[PDB]
Amino acid sequence: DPDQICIGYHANNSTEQVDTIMEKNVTVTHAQDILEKTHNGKLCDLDGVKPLILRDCSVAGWLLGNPMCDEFLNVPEWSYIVEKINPANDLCYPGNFNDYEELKHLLSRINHFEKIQIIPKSSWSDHEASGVSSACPYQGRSSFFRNVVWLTKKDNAYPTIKRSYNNTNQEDLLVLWGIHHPNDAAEQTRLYQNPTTYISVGTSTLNQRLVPKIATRSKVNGQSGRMEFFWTILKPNDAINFESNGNFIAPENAYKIVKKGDSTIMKSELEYGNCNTKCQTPIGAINSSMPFHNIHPLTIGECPKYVKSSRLVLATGLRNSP
Amino acid sequence: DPDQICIGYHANNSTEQVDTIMEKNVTVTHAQDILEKTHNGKLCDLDGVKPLILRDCSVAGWLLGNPMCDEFLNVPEWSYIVEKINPANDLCYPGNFNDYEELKHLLSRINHFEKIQIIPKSSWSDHEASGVSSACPYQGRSSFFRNVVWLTKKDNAYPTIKRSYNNTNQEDLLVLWGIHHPNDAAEQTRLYQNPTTYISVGTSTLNQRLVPKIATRSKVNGQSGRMEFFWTILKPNDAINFESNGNFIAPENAYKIVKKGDSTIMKSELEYGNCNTKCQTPIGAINSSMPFHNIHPLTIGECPKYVKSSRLVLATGLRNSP
Amino acid sequence: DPDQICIGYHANNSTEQVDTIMEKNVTVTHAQDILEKTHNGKLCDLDGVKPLILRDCSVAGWLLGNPMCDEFLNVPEWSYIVEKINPANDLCYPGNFNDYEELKHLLSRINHFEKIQIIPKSSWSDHEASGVSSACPYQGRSSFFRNVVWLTKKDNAYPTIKRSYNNTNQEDLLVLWGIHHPNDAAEQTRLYQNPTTYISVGTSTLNQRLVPKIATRSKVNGQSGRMEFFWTILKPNDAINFESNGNFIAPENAYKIVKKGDSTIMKSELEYGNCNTKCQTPIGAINSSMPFHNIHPLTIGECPKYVKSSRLVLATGLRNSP
Amino acid sequence: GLFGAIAGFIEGGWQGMVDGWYGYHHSNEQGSGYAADKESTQKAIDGVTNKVNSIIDKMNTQFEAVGREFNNLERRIENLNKKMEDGFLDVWTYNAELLVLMENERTLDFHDSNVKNLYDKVRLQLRDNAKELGNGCFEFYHRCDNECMESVRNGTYDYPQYS
Amino acid sequence: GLFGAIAGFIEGGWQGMVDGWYGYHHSNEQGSGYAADKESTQKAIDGVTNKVNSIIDKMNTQFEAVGREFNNLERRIENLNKKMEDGFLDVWTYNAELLVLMENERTLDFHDSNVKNLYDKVRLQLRDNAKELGNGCFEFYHRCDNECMESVRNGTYDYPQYS
Amino acid sequence: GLFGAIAGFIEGGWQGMVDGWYGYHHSNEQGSGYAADKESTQKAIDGVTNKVNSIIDKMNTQFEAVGREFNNLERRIENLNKKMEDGFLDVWTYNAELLVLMENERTLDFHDSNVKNLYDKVRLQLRDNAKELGNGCFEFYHRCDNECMESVRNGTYDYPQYS
Ligand SMILES: *[C@@H]1O[C@H](CO)[C@@H](O)[C@H](O)[C@H]1NC(C)=O
Ligand SMILES: *[C@@H]1O[C@H](CO)[C@@H](O)[C@H](O)[C@H]1NC(C)=O
Ligand SMILES: *[C@@H]1O[C@H](CO)[C@@H](O)[C@H](O)[C@H]1NC(C)=O
Ligand SMILES: *[C@@H]1O[C@H](CO)[C@@H](O)[C@H](O)[C@H]1NC(C)=O
Ligand SMILES: *[C@@H]1O[C@H](CO)[C@@H](O)[C@H](O)[C@H]1NC(C)=O
Ligand SMILES: *[C@@H]1O[C@H](CO)[C@@H](O)[C@H](O)[C@H]1NC(C)=O
Ligand SMILES: *[C@@H]1O[C@H](CO)[C@@H](O)[C@H](O)[C@H]1NC(C)=O
Ligand SMILES: *[C@@H]1O[C@H](CO)[C@@H](O)[C@H](O)[C@H]1NC(C)=O
């Protein structure tokens, strides 16, 4: 009956809920989700730059030039690299890659190689520079790694090798080489005349002297021999010196490091998605203005911060009354 | 005189104190301690499974079969392993264990071995497979490690050894072997005819070629010789190939890895306690419903979270008035 | 004009501002800065103890006794060590120091060495113990490291060396020695008669057998030869045994570890400042009662806690009204 | 909540006030109606917008994990590396989840405070000229037209005029 | 504390109220007695029980240290490993100790708030029918029997009936 | 702020009160003057001093970085080591910057609370003996000399004497 004025506040049809310390599922008038929970399930270009998808090849298989990896003989620049968990085409001829994980850590800071020739096959006058094996088949015929040469005796002789390469490029240079470990003394002399051999390698910082280990080993890819590979970064104006009297898997090609920057090696079974993104993960790409996400901890690009939360929602409005 | 109603709150005889940011020792009506501060001082079974207490033996001494460790020749499955800080019975015959810490890291994921014979003493026709030393006494008489064999020349001859073991079990197999480093060329020929020797070992992933180092060294356990031991995991269907013409401490026994799971190697001077627990530490076991504790940072089992706090007490009630 | 009493609060001419979550630049009556933002720009004594400033020398150059580092031939005890990013005077004669970073980690726990003679030059009767090189010039004349000796053939002969040192001191003893890697077999015989050589080193825990690597290498300091150096800690009452028939860079001096404690190796281009401090950083020293600072994360002494904040200011007073 | 206004002495919220977060409901001879208080509504928008941005900006410099590889004889540092990356992710997840929980609570009590401060802004203007019913309303002794209601919302209610 | 009720205008607590955390003390011709307010007591129990559990549950995913061993030429990573495990333990010890300090403070002020909201629930029901003494009590002008006191605790006090 | 006193119903601060943080301004026949309330001023000094020290002491056990070196084939653990030290520094920088932001807010609202609790301490003593102007002042009906003002500040104001 008499006039009156009341003080009150907003309510609405909202069912959005938030949490506090003392209370859960508190309905509010307005809330803001700050957690991205979805991804496109694809490996995309990172800001217009396509990744390097190795498919069934490994970083080793790529860099040494396994004939199955001929696809990647001169790859264009990349944003990131995607390798499968257990790629089929690794070292076709069995054996290890020395300091492999430290090499892969270097790839994380590299976006583009430019492969060049540093020791041509034609310069091996006194040795046969055409060794092949059925462990590395290329179209049924026996073959070998493209970027290194298997030197063997010529005319029942293996004279001491003494070769230098001087890095007259402006860029750092990834050099790879190897040693062959045979089965027995028979195969040792049959391939390289000399029974007791060595390989010495020297740069300004490297001082190596490898000796082959002749031993009987379980067949891998139908081979009891092993090949152990090595690598180094050759600085501009420095030179690498090889000396050997047998078992030397010599370099043919090396890689100029022409572009450095942010990169990473993702392990993923996924294939190329034909999309573009600003943020990429191993299980998919993220397009989101949210400040947080929970997709995957390993990401590359302009990304939200990762949390393990299933839900992050901020109250912005009032407690909503029924 | 007139009627009245008052508003008040609870008080009681509580002397429990809590802290806030602005104020310390604030007496409250009710509080909850959330920090466990006591332990039973004993090494117990972990949820019904007894630990492996090595007493005065080391992991090396156990696995190689130091005669002082005959107690642990075939140990049942364990929940955790307890080793003293400096066990008396390690490598009785001096020398190192190669990649020892990495082997111990493997034990942290292992709950049970099953020891088996892989190369019987009886198969050493051309060599003496009964070498012993006073550095490894067993009841005053000279002896040696139980799980490996010290091969020496027979009839002033040490013919080249060529032995394979193929892991036809379903489980992974821990294989151990060793090389003997003598004092001088005299002892070299006296034990193994050949003056220049080697040991080569090969699996699908291993490619080793050890050469003994003859040199004069400080006496340890009355011995200037050293023995260096190695190990590997042999996968199912893979085989290990030994070749040697001297200095070879060959395998007799290997260990099948039959049970994998959570485990740990605790360093502790404590002995077995004959109790049971859900949570164990190196200085004692914890039986507690508290969410936190401050006993020791290294624990195994269903444990509270460790903090370095001396006191954690939550206020639940009102400020209590005197 | 009736009487009245009012309730109010303090205001003043303060312009000090603080921040809260909901509000920035909030003017208050009183605030407390808790972040130290300045330093003196100098390398000082740490609580009265002068640091070891290596100037243009490296830890290697110092310990081996590069002639350019004669300043540090017997340095007094230190509080910390200051090394430049790329010191000019390292290994004058080229080559590596083995396990160098692990040696430097030891220095972080050492405050004082006492250098002593363990093998005098006068004891080399059958060898020339006066080898020098123009790669290590001292006043224009060719010279060599002070604390090690370059042994060469005498009278066209290099008889096998067999020398022991027994650590009869009470302190641990840092021993250093080296092997020389020549260019070719010509230089090998010209310096040490024997063409095939070795160096064996043995303590109670060490069992080493080094073999020189003869190879052609890029000239460094006008030398294609390399020298590789090694080290060990010789416990009290233990002895080190050297045996070699060539290429042996033998010890002359060793270092008694007489004082252990807190120390660190700072990398800094700064020179000695002639001041004293309680807290030091690589870019300057801090004198401050603040609980936090943002100068540099690497500090030694009684220091405030480091944060990456540019500003930390606590409100203590009221919101100040204009 | 803490300040006793929202879901307290003011029993519920108003569906009809779509204009802002806090305000008034008048009624007189002319007609009734809702009108948001634009001062305290705007004050709250600013406060809450800033909170949100402060929460986002504080978590800028955060841990970012990186792929590393190890061979089968580097299991100790492989494991160390894993424990360290999970370590930091767990610390940051906790820092996010807790910040939200703590500030959600503060935000709701902040609204509660703003409503109570609005009630007290009216209460201190009226005094003996209106009866404090206690449900959030004030019963006028004198008549109050749309000019007179506007003065209460303005903060320009002349008490000496009506007593 | 912050809300001025506990150890404020209500000078002390009551030993005699064993029934709950907040309540009333009546006195009339019939007899005096204590009776806890079951609504705000239960509200607080729920709030505080949840706080406690939220503090326990937030610290579930926490760092767990592990034994690792290193040989005497692995002193750098041994030391690294030590620094990392102490690192995480120190971060989590701080997160626990601080959470408790911060929420203890909030809990005490929460009780203070609940007492003040109860005083205001009574104050707004009585108005002119009782004199606000200011020590936490209300002096009745009219007589109030046990039926009449029950109505105040219910929240069903009819003001028009007694004025 | 949260409690509505500072920059609320008390419109501004007093330049003239240099004695303490909160207090009174009296005026009577004798003379006017400012006098700080020493009880609530001292209470606040203690509370705020403790806060400051608690903030300093909580951060005692904190991460301290250390120089480590690696050669060019130890890039993985060099990098790991770097990520771990930046990691801890970033966690602690966040813990400091956030603690200050959170407690600054509490401190300002703490002052606001203390001023409001002082206003209510006077209000509850006077009651009908003075008129609540609503700007922070109380207009006396009876005359109040310097002995009578002192009683209000003491907390020993006899209400029955003046009504
Ligand atoms: C509210 O929280 C409960 C657990 O207390 C949960 O089970 C329920 O799904 C939540 N409400 C929703 C999703 O509407
Ligand atoms: C390699 O060639 C450059 C000139 O291109 C020369 O200056 C440099 O000395 C050479 N490097 C070595 C190691 O001989
Ligand atoms: C008061 O404390 C005594 C011990 O001093 C205890 O035994 C008693 O039960 C307490 N009173 C209660 C719970 O009402
Ligand atoms: C109470 O706190 C003080 C510091 O304020 C502390 O020294 C004391 O040990 C505490 N507990 C007591 C006296 O039981
Ligand atoms: C071990 O035995 C299996 C099956 O009996 C055989 O296939 C395998 O090749 C053997 N392994 C080696 C390394 O010879
Ligand atoms: C504020 O007042 C103080 C007097 O204590 C004076 O020293 C200071 O200069 C004044 N500040 C300004 C900006 O006038
Ligand atoms: C006040 O803060 C603003 C950002 O909120 C900043 O730009 C400014 O530099 C600060 N200091 C001033 C204006 O002195
Ligand atoms: C070194 O000297 C001590 C003192 O005579 C002797 O007892 C010890 O055997 C020696 N050490 C070695 C390794 O021979």
Q: Which domains does chain C have, with CATH numbers?
A: 1-49+271-322 (2.10.77.10), 50-270 (3.90.209.20)
Would you state the structure tokens that stand for residue A106, as one six-digit string?
């270097």
Distances (CA, A) of A214 to A183, A280, C4, C212, E63: 5, 47, 108, 22, 48
Q: Which of the listed residues A20, A25, A26, A28 should we mutate to test ligand 1's pocket, taking the one with most ligand atoms within 8 A of CB? A: A25
Cα(F56) to centroid(ligand 7), Å: 26
In sequence order, the β-bridge partners of residue D23 are A8, D36
Q: Are B239 and B227 in contact (CB under 8 A)?
A: no
User: Resolution to 1 decimal, in Å?
Assistant: 2.9
Angle at A62 between CA A71 and CA A90, to 5 degrees: 115
Contact at CB, B102 and D79, closer than 8 angstroms = no
d(Cα E55, Cα B33) in Å, to the nearest integer? 13
Contact A214, A186 (CB under 8 A): no
Experimental approach was X-ray
**Does B215 contact C238 at a Cβ distance shorter than 8 Å?**
no
Beta strands in C51-203 (DSSP E): 52-53, 81-83, 110-117, 127-128, 133-138, 141-143, 148-150, 152-153, 161-166, 173-181, 199-202
Our answer on whether the CB atom of B24 is closer than 6 Å to any ligand 4 atom is: yes
DSSP B74: T
Instruction: Give the angle C147-C151-C152 at the CA atoms, nearest 5°.
Output: 155
Instruction: State the first-to-last Cα distance of chain C, in angstroms, to the nearest integer.
Output: 29
Cα distance between residue A62 and residue C307, in whole Å: 45
The span from the first CA to the last CA of chain E, in angstroms, equals: 36
Pocket of ligand 5 (CB under 6 A): A 218; B 166, 237-239
**Closest approach of chain B CAs to the CA of D71, in angstroms?**
12
Q: How far is F108 from chain E (nearest CA, A)?
A: 12
Q: How far is the C-alpha of C102 from the C-alpha of F69, rounded, in Å?
A: 9
Check: CATH 3.40.50.150 for D1-163?
Answer: no
Contacts of A243 in chain C (CB under 8 A): 215-216
**CB neighbours of residue C228 within 10 Å:** 19
Q: Which atom of ligand 4 is nearest to the CA of B24?
A: 5
**Ligand 7 touching residue C25 (CB < 6 A):** yes
F88 interfaces chain C, CB cutoff of 8 Å: no
F107 C-alpha to ligand 4 centroid (Å):
25
Distance C322 CA to ligand 6 centre (A): 15
CB within 8 Å of E26: residues ≥ 6 apart: B3, B4, B5, B6, E32, E33, E35, E144, E146, E149
Rounded CA gap, E75 and C101, in Å? 10
- Tokens 């729920």 belong to residue: E46
D–F CB contacts, 8 A cutoff, strictly below = 52
Q: How far apart are CA A231 and CA A99, in angstroms?
A: 8
- Taking CA atoms, B187 is separated from A128, A294, B276, C201, in Å, by 45, 66, 53, 18
Do the Cβ atoms of B55 and B189 come closer than 8 Å?
no
Residue B248 β-bridge partners: B179
C143 vs C132: CA distance, rounded Å: 5
CA distance B57 to B79: 18
Distance in angstroms (rounded) separating the CA atoms of residues A95 and A226 = 5
Nearest to A52 by CA among A74, A68, A75: A75
Round to whole Å and give the CA distance between C184 and C187. Answer: 6
Amino acid at F83: K
Number of residues in chain F? 163
Identify the closest residue of chain B to F47 by CA–CA distance. B22
3-state secondary structure of E92: helix
Q: Quick check: helix, strand or coil at residue F17?
A: coil
3-state secondary structure A167-218: CCCCCCEEEEEEEEECCCHHHHHHHCCCCCCCEEEECCCCEEEECCCCCCCC
Kindly determine whether residue C9 and residue F56, on different chains, have CB atoms separated by under 8 Å. Answer: no
Angstrom distance (rounded) from CA A172 to CA A163: 20
CA atoms in the 13 A half-sphere facing the CB of B103: 21
Asked whether A147 and A253 are in contact (CB, 8 A), the reply is: yes
Report the distance separating Cα B221 and Cα A235, nearest Å.
51
How many residue pairs from chains E and F have C-beta atoms closer than 8 A?
A: 54
* Selection from D46, D24, D34, D60 nearest residue A316 by Cα: D46
Give the Cα separation of B206 and A218 in Å (integer).
10
From the CB of B218, is ligand 8 less than 6 Å away?
Answer: yes
The two three-digit tokens of residue E152, written as one number: 């105040």
Q: Chain B residues with CB inside 8 Å of A95's CB? A: 207
In the β-sheet with A4-9, what is the strand arrangement from edge to edge?
A: D33-36, D22-27, A4-9, D137-140, D130-132
Is C32 exposed, middle or buried (CB count within 10 Å of its CB: 0-12, 13-18, 19+)?
middle
Q: Which two tokens stand for residue C38?
A: 């300045």
* Cα maximum dimension of chain F: 92
Chain E residues closer than 8 Å to B291 by CB: 56, 59
Ligand 2 atom 3 nearest Cα? A237
Q: How many CB atoms lie within 10 A of CB A28?
A: 23
CA distance A228 to A181: 8
What's the first-to-final CA gap in chain B, in angstroms? 28
- Which residue out of E76, E83, E91, E102 would a mutagenesis test of the C interface target, given it has the greatest number of C Cβ atoms within 10 Å? E76
Q: What is the DSSP string of A136-157?
A: EEETTEEE--SSEEE-EEBTTB
Whether the CB-CB separation of B9 and E17 falls below 8 Å is answered with yes
* Cβ separation C308–D54 shorter than 8 A: no
What is the residue extent of each domain of chain E? 1-163
